[PDB]
Scaffold this active site. Structure first.
Site, short mmCIF file in Angstrom:
data_model
loop_
_atom_site.label_atom_id
_atom_site.label_comp_id
_atom_site.label_asym_id
_atom_site.label_seq_id
_atom_site.Cartn_x
_atom_site.Cartn_y
_atom_site.Cartn_z
N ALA A 96 27.67 24.08 -54.70
CA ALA A 96 28.18 22.70 -54.60
C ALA A 96 27.45 21.79 -55.54
CB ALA A 96 28.07 22.18 -53.17
N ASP A 97 28.09 20.70 -55.95
CA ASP A 97 27.49 19.67 -56.82
C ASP A 97 28.13 18.33 -56.51
OD1 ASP A 97 25.55 19.35 -59.17
OD2 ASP A 97 27.34 18.32 -59.94
N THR A 98 27.35 17.25 -56.58
CA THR A 98 27.80 15.90 -56.25
C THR A 98 27.46 14.93 -57.38
OG1 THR A 98 27.59 16.39 -53.89
CG2 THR A 98 27.60 14.03 -54.48
#
Lengths: 183, 182
Positions: B66-68
């Site tokens: 995941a990445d934000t």
């Protein structure tokens, strides 16, 4: 300066009010069809704050109430486990409103408001409803669900304030307390 | 197949824990997001790279990456280097809306799936005192855009239109739903 009182037994309202880093005490007091859900939720937050403010008239008292409504009908804390599952079936694959009112009461100043958040649900299976009911998390909350814990998995999205869904629009509460000079 | 969370994020750990599924945390460092691509392409590329790097090491497993990104007017904001930059980022986010884009990539030998979740975040107008006092507790310094939706950063947020859990770094309901496909 006046001492601050949270007129609520709710652990979520306690946790949210703690974000303010303001000292306060907790006092819980003993709690119409012609009214709208918006008037009803505001009236209940007011009655909760006034019951404690009547006993401690030198303080600033915060009262709050949260309702889960859909198509004009509001759902309260479910009494039975079957009623909790019935509420969930109604909430499944659609949107509902979560209405939270806050009432701030002092001898020289009072303020009441509500915050409305639209909550969208995924379409839920029967298995997911009962396994969630077994956790004991639905029973304590209005509409038979909590946005925190396992209830987080049913929520597709919100349009509004997550903290207001938990029971307290904390950012607005903080802004309203600045006009009571916080203390 | 065993489950791996390719993130050291405590927020992603606490969210993936809601699923009540056993898993392990394994990470392998990957970095450069090209300006020719959109933030939506880049965030998905990043979540993919992080999951693939660990999936190559554990080919028999299901790996979640995941990445934000926190973006406004097509420009995305990283973790602040200095307190003066953190105040610069918050001054930009004050009194307006921005987007928080979280991408999730689930990788296995016979199935892979990547998606992004976008949330609109609206901030109240912020005073200089509010920004510096928030900076004085070191919560911005660890986060993209110099803020967190949890903690003292909660007081800046007026509303969201989307997924709160996605803002924390993991759209937990979409991830859960996507894991059923595996």
């Amino acid at each position: 300066t006046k001492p601050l009182i949270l007129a609520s037994q709710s652990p979520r309202r306690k946790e949210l009010l703690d974000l303010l880093q303001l000292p306060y005490s907790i006092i819980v007091s003993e709690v119409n069809r012609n009214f709208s859900p918006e008037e009803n939720v505001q009236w209940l937050a007011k009655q909760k704050a006034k019951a404690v403010a009547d006993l401690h008239p030198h303080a600033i008292v915060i009262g709050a109430d949260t309702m889960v409504c859909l198509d004009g009908e509001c759902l309260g804390k479910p009494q039975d486990q079957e009623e909790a599952a019935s509420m969930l079936r109604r909430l499944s694959g659609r949107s509902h409103s979560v209405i939270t009112a806050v009432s701030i009461q002092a001898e020289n100043h009072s303020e009441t408001f509500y915050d409305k958040t639209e909550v969208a649900f995924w379409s839920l299976s029967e298995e997911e409803i009962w396994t969630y009911i077994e956790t004991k998390e639905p029973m304590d909350k209005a509409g038979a669900y909590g946005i925190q814990g396992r209830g987080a998995l049913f929520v597709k999205k919100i349009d509004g304030d997550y903290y207001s869904v938990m029971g307290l629009p904390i950012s607005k509460t903080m802004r309203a307390l600045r006009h009571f000079d916080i203390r």
